[PDB]
């Protein structure tokens, strides 16, 4: 019940600033690999060790925390929290290359696929940096979280990201809806792809 | 100086248990709450319950509610949570976090290193299946373990190849798509994918096009 | 549908390449112009600049291509005793077995012909081009031959050079 942006990124030296929109609000950092660690607590306070560089505040239903003077080592994810409540999180990158958009390809069902009694829809997303990316399926308009499965990011050989996913079907959901979309978003920018039955 | 070290990582199948221990040292073990909080691959963290260590008492999140046994064993200075019922969607990391103190229950201070809990089906070979287009390439789908090997035309085509990292689906299986880029040419080259999955020696060469 | 090539020893799958170019000889001495691969050495196919990390002769493996369309380059037009370098614009698959053969589209090496006619017509005038075989040479040279892995392996070509575009 806490919202937070998917990603933030900004190159060393300068900020950014993580919302979170719903009491006291509190904020985690976690590295790659490890447990996350409390940076802010008290909506404004840091606790011993961290450095003032990083900030929070809150107002009306929106807190937010904002990593000032950024360093390699602040990438990272950043999830706000109240009580046992998390935010949905937010993937920071620290900027160390230029900025990509992602190539989006969507495959539909094959005819062999179809005539095992079984349909998947594949949305290959490649070339892509910051290495963070929101996938959402749509059938007609309207959104399907049932049978969707989605990679993680992953650096290809050129230094940018990856990601694939996978949306399973019946047929007969297939055949019944006029149309599937894959949307991924990038910073706030949306692309979309749309495939149809026939 | 306060520790919570946590057993390693652990492989389970669908309808399994785990029990995760958090060893605590460097503090009053009755003293403070332990919280459990678990993050899927990828996914945001998710609080599981608390157990006070004093009383054993437990306050568990409510979807987890009749799945999940938090428990302690203060002649080690151990605190458990056992998850029943296991499928595929509960892998995830699990972690144990500490209240920092009797006022502030919830700004965890302390926390273990995580379990790796990673549920997977029965060995099983792919399905193979054509993308058509350009790209094109071919669906890999329903495997268990990893890896597949996947080249095209026996080798013949190497350059243009982008084997994407599988997912790990919530049936426990894996699924992966390799494409290649062509310029289109789609009528006069053939185009044929090798997928190799040596644990259950499945071999299987499918034909791609348009 | 294939022009397959005989190769000694047999080139594996992973020896398949791209052909990028070919080097050609206009037949010295009817309103035609004869061509065969090169009658030259490696200092005619050195001078092309057009080749990349495999050494092969009469055709160019994984080299440059040209941007638009097939381009046609020579030291003398009028000269018969210097090759002629063809760069190709779109790469020909030529793809080996492992059993012996290396296989190129039929309808694909003929449209490539063609153009490379065209582009000959426009330098020499004339009509009809015509491509023969080699007239000849030591194995290296008389057939199209290339390293890969470790090994040189022989094709025979003549199936690549037997056609008349009026
Ligand atoms: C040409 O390139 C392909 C693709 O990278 C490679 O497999 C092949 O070995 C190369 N050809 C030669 C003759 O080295
Ligand atoms: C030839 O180049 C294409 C791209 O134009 C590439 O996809 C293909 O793998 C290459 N073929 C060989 C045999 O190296």
């Known amino acids: 019940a806490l919202t937070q942006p998917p990603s933030a990124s900004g190159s060393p030296g300068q900020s950014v600033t993580i919302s979170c929109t719903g009491n006291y609000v509190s904020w985690y950092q976690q590295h790659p690999g490890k447990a996350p660690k409390v940076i802010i607590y008290?909506?404004?306070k840091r606790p011993s060790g961290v450095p003032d560089r990083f900030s929070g505040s809150k107002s009306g239903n929106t807190a937010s925390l904002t990593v000032s003077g950024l360093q390699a080592d602040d990438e990272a994810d950043y999830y706000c929290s109240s009580y046992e409540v998390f935010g949905t999180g937010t993937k920071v990158t620290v900027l160390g290359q230029p900025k990509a958009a992602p190539s989006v390809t969507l495959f539909p069902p094959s005819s062999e696929e179809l005539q095992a009694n079984k349909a998947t829809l594949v949305c290959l997303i490649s070339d892509f940096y910051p290495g963070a990316v929101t996938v959402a399926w749509k059938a007609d308009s309207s959104p399907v979280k049932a049978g969707v499965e989605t990679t993680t990011p992953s650096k290809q050989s050129n230094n940018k990201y990856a990601a694939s996913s996978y949306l399973s079907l019946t047929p007969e959901q297939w055949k019944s809806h006029r149309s599937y979309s894959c949307q991924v978003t990038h910073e706030g920018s949306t692309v979309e792809k749309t495939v149809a039955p026939t | 100086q306060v520790q919570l070290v946590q057993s390693g990582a652990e492989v389970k199948k669908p309808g399994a248990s785990v029990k995760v221990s958090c060893k605590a040292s460097?503090?009053?073990?009755?003293?403070?709450?332990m919280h459990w909080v678990r993050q899927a691959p990828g996914q945001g963290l998710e609080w599981m319950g608390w157990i006070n260590p004093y009383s054993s008492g437990t306050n568990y999140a409510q979807n987890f509610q009749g799945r999940v046994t938090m428990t302690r064993d203060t002649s080690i200075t151990t605190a458990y949570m056992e998850l029943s019922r296991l499928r595929s969607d509960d892998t995830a990391v699990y972690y144990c976090?500490?209240?920092?103190?009797?006022?502030?229950?919830?700004?965890?201070?302390?926390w273990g290193q995580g379990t790796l809990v990673t549920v997977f089906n029965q060995i099983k070979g792919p399905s193979v299946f054509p993308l058509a287009p350009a790209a094109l390439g071919c669906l890999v789908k329903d495997y268990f373990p990893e890896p597949v090997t996947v080249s095209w035309n026996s080798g013949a085509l190497t350059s243009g190849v982008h084997t994407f990292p599988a997912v790990l689906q919530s049936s426990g299986l894996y699924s992966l798509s390799s494409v290649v880029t062509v310029p289109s040419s789609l009528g006069t080259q053939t185009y044929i994918c090798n997928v190799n999955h040596k644990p259950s020696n499945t071999k299987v060469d499918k034909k791609v096009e348009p | 549908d294939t022009i397959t090539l005989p190769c000694r020893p047999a080139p594996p799958p992973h020896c398949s390449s791209n052909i990028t170019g070919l080097i050609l000889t206009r037949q010295g001495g009817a309103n035609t112009v004869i061509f065969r691969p090169s009658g030259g050495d490696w200092r005619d196919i050195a001078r092309c600049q057009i080749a990349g990390t495999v050494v092969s002769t009469q055709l160019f493996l994984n080299g440059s291509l040209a941007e638009e369309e097939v381009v046609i380059r020579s030291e003398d037009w009028r000269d018969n005793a210097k090759s002629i370098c063809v760069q190709l614009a779109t790469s020909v698959e030529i793809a080996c077995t492992g059993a012996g053969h290396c296989a190129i589209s039929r309808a694909k090496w003929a449209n490539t012909l063609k153009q490379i006619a065209s582009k000959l017509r426009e330098q020499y005038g004339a009509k009809t081009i015509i491509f023969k075989p080699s007239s000849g040479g030591d194995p290296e040279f008389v057939n199209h031959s290339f390293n890969c892995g470790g090994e040189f392996f022989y094709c025979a070509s003549t199936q690549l050079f037997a056609s008349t575009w009026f």
């Open positions: 976090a500490r209240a920092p103190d009797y006022g502030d229950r919830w700004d965890f201070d302390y």
């Open positions: 460097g503090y009053t073990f009755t003293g403070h709450y």
């Open positions: 008290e909506v404004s």
